Structures are given as C-alpha cells and as structure tokens.
Design brief:
This is part of a larger assembly, with chains A (365 residues), B (272 residues), C (131 residues), D (410 residues) and E (236 residues). Chain B is α/β, with parallel strands linked by helices and 272 residues long. Chain B is 44% helix and 18% strand. Chain B is built from 7 helices and 10 strands. An 8-stranded mixed sheet of chain B has the order 6-2-3-1-10-9-8-7. Chain B has a two-stranded antiparallel ribbon with strand order 4-5. In chain B, a hairpin with a 2-residue loop joins strand 2 and strand 3. Chain B starts with 5 loop residues before the first strand and ends in a 5-residue tail after the last helix. By secondary structure, chain C is mainly alpha-helical. Chain C is built from 5 helices and 3 strands. In chain C, strands 1-3-2 form a 3-stranded antiparallel sheet. With 410 residues, chain D is mainly α. Chain E is of the alpha/beta class and 236 residues long. Chain E is 34% helix and 14% strand. The chains are: A mainly alpha (365), B alpha/beta (272), C mainly alpha (131), D mainly alpha (410), E alpha/beta (236). Chains in contact: A-B, A-D, B-C, B-D, B-E, C-D, C-E, D-E. Strand 1 of chain A pairs parallel with strand 1 of chain D, so a sheet runs across the interface. The PDB classes it as ribosome.
C-alpha cells in the first residue's frame, strides 16, 4: 500500500495498489486501466479478486471502500467486498473496513444499506465484538429514524432474529429482541403472519428467559397489543400461569415446546415473584410471614429464603422483619392499572406535594 | 477490533480551545492546539489541552512541537495523567494541511487522535469532531489518510460536570454562587413541575384514546423510582423520627446560633 | 474492648512469665481480686462504649455474660446508674435496665457545650484579671 | 549492639574509604544484619525498637539495592523479610499487613516471572494465603489513643508502608480487589476461591455461615496448607460475621435473635453474640441485644448517622434500603422527578430543542462574538500584554521611587 | 461600582477559567492545601476579568513543596504566546476546607496585596463545603492592614495596629455575574446536552440525588466544625 494523498485519480492509484495484492488482482489492476478509469470494473477488482493469502491488503481496500461510494453507485458495489470479509473468516482487518464506513461518515447512511450492509457484515464478521457497537448506533438512530423501507428493518429484524443468537448472549440477546420486538411491535412486520413466529419466539423469550417478571415486559408498552395474546401465538400461555402459581397452572399451560423445555424450575421462580408481588401489591406492601407460607405453599425459613431472592429482585425493596412485613415497595412485576392508577394517584399526590412545598421552598430561597 | 473508536472529553478541553480561541492569538477562525490525555484499549480519555502557537495555511503548517513538548513539559509537571494524543484545530474536517499536522505529530507518533472544533452556527454540527486516521499505510509522501470517525463523550470528574453545568447556566445567565441549596429547592421544584406536567398528560394520554403506552409500566415505574426515595412508604414513626430529626438538627442549628454569639462574646470583649 | 477474659491472658500469665505474680503467697487472691476488677469494670466499658443504642439493658444476660452474680451486679448496675448518673430506668424485680441516652448527634451539641462553656468562662476571666 | 552495628554499618559507609555496595559488599552485610534484626524480634524482643532496626535496615538497603542494581534474590529475601513480617503484622499491625501481604505476593509474583517459579501447588496456595488474611482490619478499640492523637500513629502506619512501597495502607475490600483484578484470584486453589465467592458475592444473610464453615474447615486442614493460613481462618471467620451481620442488618430490620442463634451456624454462640456486640460496640451495626429475652433488632433508619456503616464505609454489599439524610428529599426532587422529564417526555424535548435553538440565536451572536472578541480582545491581548504589565512595573518603579526619596531627608 | 480601596477592582471569573481549576480541583492534592495557582487577570471595566490561570504544581505526593518558578516563567511564556500576559491580579486555591482564611497564606496574601493592591484572593469551594453557600470567595485582605505594613506583629505593632483597628475580614467581591461572551461555545455545548446526546446532563442531575442520601452532609462538617470550634476558641 502507498499514498492516497496523491492525485485523485484514486482508481488509477488503487490500480497501483492492486498490483501489490493478488496476482488475479494484479492482472486486472492495470488491465482495468487500459479501458477506463472504471469506477465499477477496476473498482470491482478489489471487490471480486481476493485478499490473496492474507487480509493485509485492507489499507488498499479502505481506498476501495470509498472509491465505490462517491464516484459510483454507493451500495451497489459496497454490497460486494463485504462478503469477502466474512469469507476469509477473520474479524480484525475486515472490521477496519467496517469501522471506517459504518454510517453517516465516509458514505452517508441513506435509506440504509450503509448501516445495513456493514451491519450485516460485522454481525457475521465479528461474533460479539464489533456486532455490539452497531446496536446503539442503530438504537440512537431508531428513536430518530428507523429504516422507513420496512424490508431493511425486516432485514434488520432478520438480523435481530440472527443477532438474537449471533451474539452469544442471553439478555443482550433479549436486548437484541428488545430492539426487535420494539420495532416489531410498533411498526415493522405487520405482516401479522410474520408476527406469528416472532410472538412464538416471544413465548420462548418469556419462559426460557423467565425475566419478563412474568409477562410484565410483555405488558409494558406493546408486545400484548401487537403480538396477539390468544391467537395462533397463544402468547398469553405465560400470562395465565403468571398469577395462579402452581404446577397444574403451568403444566397445562405448557405446550409441547414448554412441556418439553421443560418448565419445572422457572415455575417456582414465577410462583415466587407473583406471590411475592401479588402478595405485596395486594396485601399491601407489608405482608405477613405466615401468609407467604400459605402463598408459596412452603415452610418458615423458606419464606425467609425467597424474600432474599425477592429483595435481590428489587421487585420488593426495604428492610424486612422476621415475623411479619415480608415484601415491600419498588413494584417490578406488572400492576397494569393499579400502578397506572397509582400513577394517576401520585401525579395528583405530587401536585399537592411539590406545589405546596416549592412555596415552602421559595420562602427560604 | 481496531483501537480508535471513541474519545471521551470534558468542556475543559473546549475551555482550553475557546479560551485560546477567544483570546485567539489573532487566530480569527483557525485556533489550533495539542490535545493531551490517555486511552483505554478502545476508548480515549482526553482531560485537558492547550494551544501551541500554530499557523495552518497554504501550504504552511506551523507546529511548534518543541513548545508542544514545552507545554507537555509544563503539563506533565502539573498533571502526570495526560499524554500527547494528537493535535486539535478548529473547523473543518479532512484537509491536506492536516496531513502536515499529521507529520509534526508523526514526529512524536503516538496514535493519531484528532479533534476538529467545528466552528459552526448550527446544532447538529458537533462542536468537537474527533477522528482517527485509517490507511495509514503510506511509505510514499507524508501521510495519506482517511478519517475513521470518533464519537465525543463526556466522562471524567463529575463535580467538574456539576461545575460546567453551573458554567453552562453561567453561559445561560449567571446564576452566581449565593443560594445554591435554596436555589436547588427551586430546581428541585422545577424538575418536580415537568414531571407533573408530563405524567398528568400521560394520565390524559390513555384517557383520551390510546396513549400511556411507553408510560403504562415505565412511568408507573418512573414514579416508583421516586417514591422509593421520598416519601418513605408512609410510616408515622418515620415522621416521628423526622420531627425528632427536625428537633435534632434544629437544636444543632440552635447551638450553632449560640456558638454564633459566644464566639463573638470572646471576640468582642477583647476588642473593647 | 470490654472483654474481661482478654485482660487475663495479658496480665496473669505474663506476670507468671515475668515471675511478678510468682512473688506473693496471697497472689492467688490478688489475682482473684483482680479477676472481678477486670470483670466488673470491663462490663462498664461494655456499657460505656455501647451506650447510645443500648436502650434496654439486661441483668439476666450480664449476670451470665461477665460471670458476675446479682448482688455484685445490683451493686454494679445501681452504681452504674446512681454514681455515673446515667439516665436509666431499672426494674430489679424484672432485672432490666432501660436507658435511652438521646442523642449521638446531640453529643456534638454536648461537644459544642464543651466549647462554648469555656467561651463564657474566660470571657468572665477577662474581666476578673482586668478588674 | 545492633544499633552499634547499624551505625558501624553506616559510619563505615560514611567513611567511604574505598567501600561500595555494588560489588555485593554491603548486600551480604545487609543479609547478616537483617537476620540480626528479624530473628530476635520474632523470638522475643520489644517490637517498637528492633523493627525500626529492621525498617532502617530495609529502607537504607532498598537504597543500597538501588545502588547495587536491584538484586532480586536479596529482594526475595526481602520478600521473606516481608513474609516474616506478614506473620508479625497479623501479630502486630493489619495495616502493615495490608502493606506486607500485598508486598508478599507481588514480589513473589515478580519472582514467578523473574525466577519462573514452578510451584504451581504452592503458588496457587500462596495466593489464597495472599487473599484471605489481607483485608481483615476491624474497628479500632483505642479510646484513649483518639484523645492521644491517632493521626500520629496512622502516619507511622503510613510511613513504614511508604518504606515497603505500598505508601497508603490499603483497605479491606479494595485490597482484595487488587488480588482479584490481578488474575491470581483465578489461580487460587478453588476452595478458597469458592470460600471467597460465598463471603463476597453470594450474599445471603441466613445462608452464608452454612457455606463458608465447610470450606473454612477445609483450609483448617493444616499440614500442607501453610500454617499461617490456619490462624488466618478464625480471624476470617471473625470477618465472616462482620460481613454477615450487616447483611442481616440491611435485609432484616429485626431478626429473631433466638433464630439468629440458629440461623447463624457459628462455632460458638456466646462468643458469637459477644462478637456481634464487638462489632456493634465498636460501631459496626445497630443491634438491641441486651433485651432481656435475647432479641436483636436493627432499625430503619433510627440510628443512621455513623454506627451502621463501620464506620463510614460498609463491608457488606448493596442490600441496604433507602435511608434519608441531609438534602436527600431536595435532591431526589432534582433527579428522580427529572427522571421522567428527560427521556420519556416531550415536554423537555420541546423545551430543550427550543434551548437547542435558543443557544443557536446566541450562537449566531457567538459568531458575531467570534468576530467581536477578534475585534476587541485581540486589541486587549496586545494592550494587556503592555499597558497593565507596566502597572505591575509601576508597582516596581514606585518602590524604586520611594527608596531615593527616603535617601534624601534623614 | 466594584472598587475597593483606591487601586482594586472586583474579579470577573468566566467559566472557561473555572474548568481549568476543576481539572486540578481537590486532586493532585486532596488533603493537601494546593495553592491551585495565581489568578492571571486583566484590568478592565470595574472587573478583573481572569482570562487563563495555571495550576502551580507543588511537590504533591503527601505534602506541598514550592516547585519551579521556571514553571511560572514558562506558563507566563506559554500564555503570552497565545493569550494575555501574566497579569496576576490574585491567587487561588480551594483547597480542603470550607471557608477558611489560612494565616500563613494570608501573609502570602498580604505581601501580594502590598505589592499589587489590585488583588483579591480566591478560595474555591467544591461540594466538600457540603453545598453550602458562597462557593467562590475572592477574599482580599484589609487595606487598613495593608496600611500598617509590615505586618501584624506579635507584641509590638499589635496594640498600635489595633488602636487604628484595621478590619479582619474585608471585601469578598462578587465574582461572576455576567455573560462575558467568553461563554460562547460552552453555551453551544449546553444545547447539545440538552440535545439528543443528553446522557451527560442527567448524570450531573444524578450527582444530586446521591449527594443527599447517605453522606453526612451536615454531621461530618459539624464534627469538623466542632473540632475546629473547641480548639481555636479556647486557644484564643
């Protein structure tokens, strides 16, 4: 590799760079020069012809990155040479190309293949190192502009079905689902038939991962209002067992994916955190010690055991007493209207509070 | 993964830019300097800088790197934390003259961490644009570069960010240092007000047709994140502790008013 | 530390190591005299140091803890209440000491009344010498 | 005589009649005199004096190692002089042991790199020797010494740690985290690693002494696991309870102490409940133990000034509840009321996009000020370089003016 | 308007000065009274507008030994290269106390003000004064004391100087009041955080909610005060 602070004239310059690369890159290095400047063909001679024995060429391919964007059609040719990156199965110097381009600098995230081709690349190029960095780079653009052509977002959803597991993760996986199902739920893949298998995956996401607290992230904004609850889905499989807290309530709700998963140990997690919360939010933020013995169908210090799990959950959060007042405020399991009514209570309660009290404040201010 | 991805800053960098840009050394638009800081394995921690007298022109680039050693001589004497990470200049981005400012910094040659201070009249134009140079091969002329973009963030000492937010309110309108805790109460009532102004409309959001979607079980939790702090749930022995803690710290305030006098009663008798 | 037992390791064995205990024929009594002088008084430093949060103090536990019988303990705890003048309710039929000192942040109010009372004295002494 | 020898070490060097250390002359003179210090100290000696004869030996000969191009094998002896002292500073001063056991391990870990020690059973067991004893620094018991100026003592606790090269004496938890962040915690023979991972992370107020005591008794198996370690166990089991009691104090507000007798399976009960107070009497947590029926409440908040914290900094993990102090309720009205204001709102988003433009009006004025300071303060940049710099020189010239005026009427 | 006694104006410290102070805030010297620099201003309308100031690095490992003047001679060279000359119109510290006038530093303040009477001496206060009012104290020393010079002396020139009765505190000037248009781009950094990269503004609001919850914001100050009250009063 040599300079690109030369005359520009970069295709003739990259031709002098392709002569250093592969011999098949070299035969169409200067053979691309006799015909034209050739912003496609000589520019495809990096895109077609391989990084010869190693990916040490990438300095010249960063030139071949930006040469097929501004003088030529950008995402037509950059869709090639990024599948060469996955094909060598290396993730460092391929990522040097993908970092230089990624979006909105050196090539203008349109209408998004500029993210997407680089986004599809570095998901396949890097397993869980560079593939993470484009997710907030998506998400900071998601709340500004998701790809309005939904198929790129569906292709991103295809990746958010892939990077759901192309990341070797469980909650970044679920975060990749929470980039997916958020954009699934609001506006992409509607296509309710596509929203079948996504909500079928959300049944997996709620019982393989029991961290919906029961169905509460699926009752927070819109996995229940878009992904239909009792449809072909039967997404309310989890939510029927989310309040009833015994084996028969799980096992008969257990379809043969869940009845063969199996659901036997997230049960008493779920039996806990509902009877914790629906003990707590009902009986009422100070519940008795022998009540949870009757709630959780257990003995004395096992109630004392599960409160430690429940305070570490921070669904309930205060100091506990040994003989009464077991589970307490910070309310993480779903209180669908009762916390909304409490939202309707507290915004009335704060209105009487802070307005009276800022007057008490501005007296001493 | 290739190293240069993110630069973390403070406005003390933007202080040292703009104080050397708004006393200016006659550098009407181009005020150029040398950033100093450290890196961490993918990230860059720039925490202070200073402007060397530069002159970037066609095709003159003046970099008094000996003074950028001498400023580094002074700053390493002051603060042993920072290393010369590059050169900062004002707007705008990639130039063939920066290729010269590469070379004066490539005389030193640590990793190329640039800071272009986009002197723009806009909002989306970022006031500090950071770049690492890619390809970055170049055994041929000076330094042929493409700038991989670097994102600018603020993560360093936090009461400086309490300080600069007071400075940004001093930027807004001073806001001198007189009332601060009493003024915090009105700020505490101001954040209280938009909370009530939003979430009662979030009551109204679902009450009109179909709002309070991202507020059903988030703002119900966002208010729960407050009421776990204040008020405690509603215990009356808590208030009895509180009214004791009224009468505790008021008695502390009472004896502070007593020691207000008795300090003077030794002071003013010996000044008859 | 308020532990009586730990003093006995540091004194009795070491004065036998240095033969200092080995000097009297009465020294077994003198040790046994100083057994209780360690037991009764480290019970006080047990009460003196842990004083703000002790608001109910046993007499059944302290008779078992510091190995001290009740007519000593009644001679301890009454003189812990009477002679030290600690605000302390006592029910010797119930064998219960109830103290409630109130307060440790107002100990700084005591620490400032340590300061400002000196303020009034030398202010008065400023006029005492000068007149 | 050891003071005499140290002087007839020093004054003989202070002769400097053809004598150096770098020929390894004074480095065995060290090795003799260091032994002369360290043996009598351990055997039977006053500790205040001969350890200064050791510390003045170790410090000067650290400079003589610095003179003689640091020899790592007398530094391995200095490591052993530390390793001697790690026994002694578990006998004499834990903050020195905070210095020396951290100096024990890394100066050995240097020799794991320098000498390439193939002691993969021992080095995996000297690291657990380096983890467990290293944090345990309880509350001081010295009430007179606080009146007798503790800051002089901690200075000497600092100063002879500056001698060893670990200048500030490190704490309980952050000194563990030195050994944790360094990858030798991975290299622990994994029972202690698990014994740590009960004591550190799996943090359950009723279910902690049940899982450590099995592994505490594991490392009580003495004959090969470094008999330093077996004295480190009950003082770790002492630090187990202080790790435990606050975790009981900050999930539970009133444990039943008759249950807490059973729910804490400590070896003793009377020395347990005494060490319960021996925490709380020295202000480590809130207990009500001399209730006559043997209960033990904690309270929330009700004592929340210093005594719950041991003494201002906790030893447990963040299971504590929301407590309230000075300007909580004001600053919770600042953030947790603005917690709905920045992200989910549009009410700030319409106000601060306005402010995004309200600055941009001033920023359009700022470019007018980018030319106005260019117009004004450039002229100030030259004039304040000259005119007001003469006014400092006026204060230097008027001083010369008053001198000649005073030299006229005398 | 902002004059004191016949030579001195108030100080006007814009925020771009302030940030370089809080680069060396209460660090590189935490329990060590770093004289954090000399206030290099300029004499303009009613106000000593500080332009840039340089933190003086005393030999700070656990103490403070006076370092090179060649530092100060090169910082005045570094500042003359790009900005205003060394018009030191004060000196400033913070430095580990709430509102204290250090007697030996007051003597360093006295001969400073005998040399340049146009001087106020800044005592910065971060949140270690528990916030807390008057976080910026540009305390100058009494010109009636600058009259009877030198200095305050112990048995002679103490009856003589206090029958004149020079004041003991005098003229803590109001410091920052105005948009001085050095403001310009840190105002423009405020609108961006305001704007959609607003993660850094709430973190400073997050610094409120935890400053009040668990710190002895009153008690640890008062315990340092009750320390300072029971000692310094009885010695007088």
């Amino acid at each position: 590799f040599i300079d690109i602070s030369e005359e520009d004239q970069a295709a003739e310059l990259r031709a002098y760079l392709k002569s250093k690369g592969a011999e098949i890159s070299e035969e169409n290095s200067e053979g691309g020069l006799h015909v034209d400047l050739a912003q496609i063909i000589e520019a495809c001679d990096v895109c077609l012809k391989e990084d010869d024995k190693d990916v040490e060429s990438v300095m010249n391919s960063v030139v071949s990155l930006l040469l097929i964007l501004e003088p030529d059609k950008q995402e037509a040719l950059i869709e090639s040479l990024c599948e060469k990156l996955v094909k060598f199965r290396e993730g460092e110097r391929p990522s040097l190309r993908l970092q230089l381009l990624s979006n909105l600098f050196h090539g203008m995230d349109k209408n998004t293949p500029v993210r997407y081709t680089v986004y599809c690349s570095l998901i396949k190029v890097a397993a869980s190192c560079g593939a993470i960095q484009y997710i907030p780079t998506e998400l900071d653009q998601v709340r500004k502009w998701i790809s309005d052509w939904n198929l790129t977002t569906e292709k991103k959803h295809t990746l958010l079905r892939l990077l759901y597991e192309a990341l070797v993760d469980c909650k970044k996986s679920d975060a990749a689902s929470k980039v997916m199902v958020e954009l699934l739920g609001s506006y992409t893949e509607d296509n309710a038939s596509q929203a079948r298998v996504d909500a079928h995956r959300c049944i997996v996401r709620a019982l393989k991962d029991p961290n919906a607290f029961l169905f509460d992230h699926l009752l927070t904004l819109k996995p229940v209002k878009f992904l239909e609850g009792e449809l072909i889905h039967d997404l309310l499989t989890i939510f029927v067992s989310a309040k009833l807290a015994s084996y028969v309530k799980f096992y008969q709700n257990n379809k043969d994916f869940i009845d063969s998963l199996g659901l036997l140990h997230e049960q008493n997690m779920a039996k806990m955190r509902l009877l914790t919360f629906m003990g707590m939010a009902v009986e009422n933020k100070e519940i008795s010690f022998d009540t949870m013995q009757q709630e959780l169908q257990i003995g004395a210090d096992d109630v004392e055991a599960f409160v430690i799990d429940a305070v570490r959950t921070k669904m309930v959060y205060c100091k506990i007493d040994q003989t009464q007042r077991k589970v307490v405020v910070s309310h993480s399991t779903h209180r669908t209207f009762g916390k909304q009514q409490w939202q309707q209570l507290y915004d009335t309660l704060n209105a009487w509070k802070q307005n009276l009290n800022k007057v008490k404040n501005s007296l001493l201010s | 993964f290739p190293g240069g991805r993110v630069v973390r800053l403070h406005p003390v960098i933007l202080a040292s830019i703009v104080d050397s840009y708004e006393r200016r050394n006659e550098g009407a638009a181009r005020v150029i300097g040398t950033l100093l800081g450290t890196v961490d394995k993918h990230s860059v921690e720039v925490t202070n800088c200073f402007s060397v007298p530069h002159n970037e022109s066609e095709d003159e680039v003046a970099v008094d790197m000996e003074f950028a050693k001498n400023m580094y001589e002074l700053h390493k004497k002051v603060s042993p934390n920072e290393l010369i990470l590059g050169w900062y200049a004002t707007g705008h981005d990639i130039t063939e003259h920066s290729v010269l400012i590469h070379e004066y910094y490539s005389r030193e040659a640590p990793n190329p961490i640039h800071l272009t201070v986009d002197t723009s009249l806009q909002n989306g134009r970022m006031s500090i644009k950071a770049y690492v140079s890619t390809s970055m091969g170049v055994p041929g002329r000076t330094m042929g570069v493409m700038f991989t973009p670097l994102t600018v963030k603020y993560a360093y000492y936090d009461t400086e960010r309490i300080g600069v937010d007071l400075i940004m309110k001093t930027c807004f309108s001073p806001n001198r240092v007189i009332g601060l805790s009493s003024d915090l109460q009105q700020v505490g009532g101001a954040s209280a007000r938009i909370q009530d102004a939003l979430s009662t409309v979030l009551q109204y959001a679902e009450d009109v047709l179909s709002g309070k979607v991202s507020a059903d079980n988030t703002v119900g939790r966002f208010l729960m994140s407050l009421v776990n702090q204040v008020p405690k749930i509603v215990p009356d022995d808590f208030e009895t502790m509180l009214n004791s803690n009224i009468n505790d710290l008021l008695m502390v305030t009472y004896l502070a008013n007593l020691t207000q006098s008795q300090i003077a009663l030794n002071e003013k008798l010996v000044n008859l | 530390m308020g532990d009586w037992k730990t003093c006995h390791s540091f004194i009795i064995n070491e004065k036998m190591n240095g033969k200092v205990w080995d000097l009297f024929p009465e020294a077994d009594k003198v040790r046994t005299m100083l057994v209780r002088k360690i037991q009764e008084e480290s019970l006080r430093t047990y009460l003196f140091t842990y004083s703000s949060v002790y608001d109910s103090i046993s007499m059944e536990t302290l008779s078992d803890m510091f190995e001290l019988d009740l007519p000593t303990v009644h001679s301890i705890i009454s003189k812990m209440i009477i002679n030290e003048e600690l605000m302390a309710s006592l029910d010797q039929p119930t064998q219960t000491v109830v103290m409630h000192r109130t307060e440790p942040t107002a100990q700084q109010n005591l620490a400032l009344q340590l300061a400002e009372k000196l303020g009034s004295l030398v202010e008065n002494n400023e006029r005492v010498f000068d007149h | 005589k050891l003071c005499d020898n140290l002087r007839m070490h020093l004054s003989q060097i202070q002769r400097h009649h053809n004598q150096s250390t770098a020929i390894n002359l004074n480095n065995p003179e060290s090795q003799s005199m260091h032994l002369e210090t360290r043996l009598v100290q351990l055997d039977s000696a006053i500790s205040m004096e001969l350890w200064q004869e050791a510390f003045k030996a170790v410090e000067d000969i650290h400079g003589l190692f610095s003179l003689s191009k640091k020899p790592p094998k007398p530094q391995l002896m200095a490591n052993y002089y530390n390793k001697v002292s790690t026994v002694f500073w578990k006998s004499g001063n834990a903050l020195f042991h905070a210095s020396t056991l951290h100096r024990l391990y890394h100066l050995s870990r240097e020799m794991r790199k320098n000498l390439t020690q193939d002691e993969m059973q021992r080095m995996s067991t000297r690291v657990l020797l380096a983890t467990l004893s290293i944090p345990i620094t309880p509350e001081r018991t010295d009430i007179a010494r606080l009146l007798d100026m503790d800051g002089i003592i901690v200075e000497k606790q600092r100063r002879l740690a500056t001698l060893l090269g670990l200048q500030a004496p490190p704490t309980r938890i952050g000194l563990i985290n030195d050994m944790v962040r360094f990858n030798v915690l991975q290299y622990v023979v994994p029972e202690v690693k698990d014994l740590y991972n009960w004591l550190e992370v799996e943090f359950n107020p009723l279910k902690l002494c049940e899982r450590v005591t099995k592994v505490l008794n594991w490392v009580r198996e003495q004959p090969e696991k470094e008999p330093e370690l077996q004295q480190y166990v009950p003082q770790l089991q002492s630090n187990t309870i202080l790790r435990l009691l606050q975790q009981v104090a900050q999930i539970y507000q009133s444990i039943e102490f008759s249950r807490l007798t059973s729910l804490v399976p400590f070896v003793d009960a009377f020395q347990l409940e005494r060490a319960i107070v021996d925490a709380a009497r020295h202000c480590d947590l809130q207990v009500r133990i001399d209730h006559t029926s043997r209960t033990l409440s904690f309270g929330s908040d009700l004592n929340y000034a210093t005594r719950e914290d041991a003494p201002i900094g906790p030893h447990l993990q963040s299971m504590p509840s929301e407590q309230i102090r000075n300007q909580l309720t004001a600053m919770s009205s600042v953030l947790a009321k603005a917690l709905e204001v920045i992200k989910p709102a549009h009410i700030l988003q319409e106000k601060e996009e306005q402010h995004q433009l309200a600055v941009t009006a001033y920023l359009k004025n700022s470019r007018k000020e980018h030319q106005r300071i260019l117009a004004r303060r450039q002229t100030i940049e030259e004039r304040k370089e000259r005119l007001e710099s003469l006014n400092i020189q006026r204060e230097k010239e008027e001083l010369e003016q008053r001198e000649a005026e005073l030299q006229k009427v005398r | 308007g902002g004059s004191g006694d016949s030579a001195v104006k108030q100080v006007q410290i814009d925020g771009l000065v302030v940030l370089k102070i809080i680069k060396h805030y209460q660090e590189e010297g935490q329990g060590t009274e770093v004289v954090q620099g000399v206030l290099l201003g300029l004499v303009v309308e009613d106000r000593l507008e500080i332009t840039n100031c340089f933190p003086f690095p005393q030999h700070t490992e656990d103490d403070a030994d006076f370092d090179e003047v060649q530092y100060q001679m090169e910082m005045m060279r570094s500042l003359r290269h790009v900005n205003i000359d060394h018009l030191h119109v004060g000196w400033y510290q913070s430095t580990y106390y709430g509102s204290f006038v250090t007697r030996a530093l007051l003597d360093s303040q006295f001969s400073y003000q005998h040399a340049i009477e146009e001087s106020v001496v800044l005592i910065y206060d971060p949140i270690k004064t528990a916030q807390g009012s008057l976080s910026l104290k540009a305390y100058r020393l009494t010109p009636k004391l600058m009259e009877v010079c030198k200095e305050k002396d112990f048995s002679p020139e103490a009856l003589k100087k206090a029958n004149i009765t020079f004041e003991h505190m005098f003229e803590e000037v109001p410091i920052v009041i105005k948009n001085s248009h050095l403001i310009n781009v840190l105002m423009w950094e405020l609108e961006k955080k305001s704007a959609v990269a607003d993660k850094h503004e709430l973190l400073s609001l997050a610094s409120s909610n935890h400053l009040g919850k668990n710190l002895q914001l009153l008690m640890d100050r008062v315990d340092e005060m009750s320390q300072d009250i029971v000692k310094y009063n009885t010695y007088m």
